[model samples]
Target: KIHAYTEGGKPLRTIYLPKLLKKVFLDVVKPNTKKNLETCGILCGKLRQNAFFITHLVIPLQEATSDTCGTTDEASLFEFQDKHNLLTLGWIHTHPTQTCFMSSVALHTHCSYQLMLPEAIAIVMAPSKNTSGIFRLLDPEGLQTIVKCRKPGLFHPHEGKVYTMVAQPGHVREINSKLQVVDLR
Candidate 1:
């Protein structure tokens, strides 16, 4: 299960998805495409910065679905979590030629998981050039919301491999197509 609550609802912590895991999602992107974990680190590293700590990633998988083309193949999830000592905070999936964002089905799925694991995150992975999406969280009382859209966090080669780094416990907002920083750290 992913972690939804950070620092007792401070609502300002980052979620990190390892490089190999993303390759798993990209591998399942196509019916016959192959993905090598070691070699695929570049792709995963690049995408990790896309969401990093700013937004959550929701990766859906055919193996995890009940459709004819989908099956549950999450045997490695447990091992992966155990080996890496991670809590699988967010997820991502593809929507064949579809745009970015969650579908009705995906939202329902996310809420279902939320009931059991409110700390878990939802990610809808889609390819787009105009805007990089971001996932946001709220103050629970509906007083405030944290979002990082338009100019979502990106990889900084100088920041080491361009991976998802935590946002130092604070509020992040996406307004006027720019990032507005609110320190809650």
Candidate 2:
């Protein structure tokens, strides 16, 4: 199980990352690195013993702006998800023009829905900075508050204390597994 806190408490939920996943992220960012366009993808995995082991990353056909990247083809996304027998575990994206953190309040709203799944996370990668981190809602109160609210545009919820994303935690690591290469070019 992946622990939200590094100090060692009950796990938030468990998700496995294979060694090749990082390389996938690198390839996902490579094409647009010079263009400075946002790149994004869905994180997929299997469930076992009440834990999740992330097995694939799906970069659907998408449209990109400098600050936003979203899938443009849901049919394609669904087809991929169905074929792989995978669940949407989380999301990962690059902040081409910004830092590695989810900077805008818009991001908070988007991420809130993903965090509702408990095991879901938001990974922000800054390829230029060579930095990345995984994040989730604070749980209990934090998770509930974001879901109930309906504000728009960029926002700072709970004075920026509503979530926690970390660079390194003991429970998150790459393990040996059969790897599937996902490159959409």
Best by the lDDT measure: 2
* TM-score of each prediction: 0.40, 0.80
Best by TM-score: 2
Task: Kindly list the per-residue Cα lDDT of model 1 for residues 9-105, writing each as its tens digit.
Answer: 6433333443344334445444422221111011111124323332222222234221112223345444444554444444445443445554434
The residue-level lDDT of candidate 2 at 161 comes to 56
State the TM-score for model 1: 0.40
lDDT value for model 1: 0.32
Q: Give candidate 2's TM-score.
A: 0.80
Q: How accurate locally, in lDDT, is each candidate?
A: 0.32, 0.67
> Lowest-lDDT window of 10 residues in candidate 2?
1-10
lDDT of 2: 0.67
In order, what is each prediction's RMSD in angstroms?
15.2, 3.4
Cα error, candidate 1, residue 103 (Å): 1.0
